């Protein structure tokens, strides 16, 4: 019982150029070699994510702008959020986010 979902709305009115203000990186199963999703590698202390006050490194992504990523590779997912954050989420000024983090 050390897992909790986190849905956040990240405004990038200014970060629109930086995408949002975070570095993403996903893993891959050891044997299955299947993408294990993306994880916040490093949040730009200043971007939209860091300003949101709800984004923290080591947070696994599940859905961005109402678009799940579990149905795609890490690179595809990070790219899916990239476009979703700089094309659909920015359109209004903020992108919807859904990440899962373990209690630690």
């Amino acid at each position: 019982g050390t897992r909790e979902f986190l849905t956040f709305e990240v405004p990038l009115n200014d970060s629109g150029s930086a995408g949002l203000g975070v570095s993403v990186k996903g893993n891959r199963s050891k044997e299955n070699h299947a993408d294990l999703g993306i994880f916040v590698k490093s949040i730009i202390n200043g971007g939209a994510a860091s300003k949101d006050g709800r984004l923290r490194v080591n947070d696994q992504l599940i859905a961005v702008n109402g678009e799940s990523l579990l149905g795609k590779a890490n690179q595809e997912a990070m790219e899916t959020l990239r476009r979703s954050m700089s094309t659909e989420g920015n359109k209004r000024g903020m992108i919807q986010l859904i990440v899962a983090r373990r209690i630690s």
């Binding site: 975070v22 570095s23 993403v24 990186k25 050891k30 294990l36 990070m78």
Partner: peptide
């Protein structure tokens, strides 16, 4: 448990 071939993407 990565394959030592990960990568980061600035978003």
């Amino acid at each position: 448990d990565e394959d030592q071939h990960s990568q980061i993407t600035k978003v």
